[PDB]
Write a protein that binds this ligand. Structure first.
Ligand SMILES: CCc1nc(N)nc(NCCc2ccccc2)c1-c1ccc2c(c1)N(CCCOC)CCC2
Ligand SMILES: *[C@@H]1O[C@H](CO)[C@@H](O)[C@H](O)[C@H]1NC(C)=O
Length: 333
């Protein structure tokens, strides 16, 4: 099965799912960086303006709803949501599965008012599931219908004309229509986390970063490519970028000349051009241009670690192999 994704400003990729009977529709981000499922609850106080601006799940309108009530709190590096667990039938591109999900009742203005999606569908391992809830992919596999224990992501470059698919997730395999050459794999350090070993990071002609090695979390739920404050400060200085409150910037006119940045994964250099990592929205020297690379300190056990989000997946079609506990990259097309 495949799910069509919408690309919002190159920073948010989401698709649709259906919950309950009759189906209640929701926009959600398929996130390899988390393992739980959640959507806003009709029980979310309207005092949370974020709940006033999103689709809310009303249990009392679903004849397939199954109460639970256990509380849970999901924490992402940029925000937190809280609520309780509920069960109901979820639709994901043709596939129908009974699933346990979080009904959020506390959804902070910052950052969820800036969220185009309503909720999230974790594609991570059960080892990372808050409340030990079975992840939706695990449940789908238990039906022995998928041809393979894998799923793939394609994130298209933002488009200005509503006629190009924003992105696509394939449950069961990959789609040769969106990648060329063949895959190249790197094995997961440990099962339970979509994190792999990264041999090094280079900016231009000098492997100045992540020498000796470092970790890389492959996060489909992350807008950018991120590293530890230390690492980024070092990377950014080599680019001549000035730090701000939430990002790094360069004079727009300097963007096109910025050097390449390479990530050494499993004996294969993955290279990005400045066009790949800077939001070139002008060529003026009198204006600042943001970079799609941020600093983000991720705490143990997962971190410290780099994160390969949307900025990296736009360029490289990604396959998440569960059966073999490896990740595969190929040139996006
Ligand atoms: C999909 C949920 C999610 N999962 C994971 N693993 N990390 C997140 N941020 C931690 C990583 C991160 C760092 C810096 C900026 C954005 C995300 C977020 C998360 C949380 C809040 C918001 C997000 C993303 N977005 C971006 C959606 C991404 O779609 C592909 C915009 C609205 C507010
Ligand atoms: C919620 O689901 C979990 C999963 O097994 C179960 O152990 C728990 O008892 C349920 N809570 C209630 C009261 O239904």
């Amino acid at each position: 099965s495949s799910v069509i994704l919408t690309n919002y400003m190159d920073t948010q990729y989401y698709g649709e799912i259906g919950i309950g009977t009759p189906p209640q529709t929701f926009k959600v981000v398929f996130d390899t960086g988390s393992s739980n499922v959640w959507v806003p609850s009709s029980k979310c106080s309207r005092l949370y303006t974020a709940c006033v601006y999103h689709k809310l799940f009303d249990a009392s309108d679903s004849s397939s709803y199954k109460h639970n009530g256990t509380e849970l709190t999901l924490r992402y590096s940029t925000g937190t949501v809280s609520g309780f667990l509920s069960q109901d039938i979820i639709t994901v591109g043709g596939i129908t599965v009974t699933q346990m999900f979080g009904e959020v009742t506390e959804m902070p203005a910052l950052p969820f008012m800036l969220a185009e999606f309503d909720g999230v569908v974790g594609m991570g391992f059960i080892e990372q599931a808050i409340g030990r809830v079975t992840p939706i992919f695990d449940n789908i596999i238990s039906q022995g219908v998928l041809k393979e224990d894998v799923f793939s992501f394609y994130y298209n470059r933002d488009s200005e004309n509503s006629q190009s698919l924003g992105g696509q997730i394939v449950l069961g395999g990959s789609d040769p229509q969106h990648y060329e050459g063949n895959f190249h794999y790197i094995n997961l350090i440990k099962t339970g986390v979509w994190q792999i070993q990264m041999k090094g990071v280079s900016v231009g002609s000098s492997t100045l970063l992540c020498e000796d090695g470092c970790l890389a979390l492959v996060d489909t739920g992350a807008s950018y490519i991120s590293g530890s404050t230390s690492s980024i400060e070092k990377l950014m200085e080599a680019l001549g970028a000035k730090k701000r409150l939430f990002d790094y910037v360069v004079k727009c006119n300097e963007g096109p000349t910025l050097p390449d940045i390479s990530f050494h994964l499993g004996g294969k250099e993955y290279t990005l051009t400045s066009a790949d990592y800077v939001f070139q929205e002008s060529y003026s020297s009198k204006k600042l241009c943001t970079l799609a690379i941020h600093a983000m300190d991720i705490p143990p056990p997962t971190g410290p670690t780099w994160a390969l989000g949307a900025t990296f997946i736009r360029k490289f079609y990604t396959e998440f192999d569960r059966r073999n506990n490896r990740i595969g990259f190929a040139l996006a097309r």
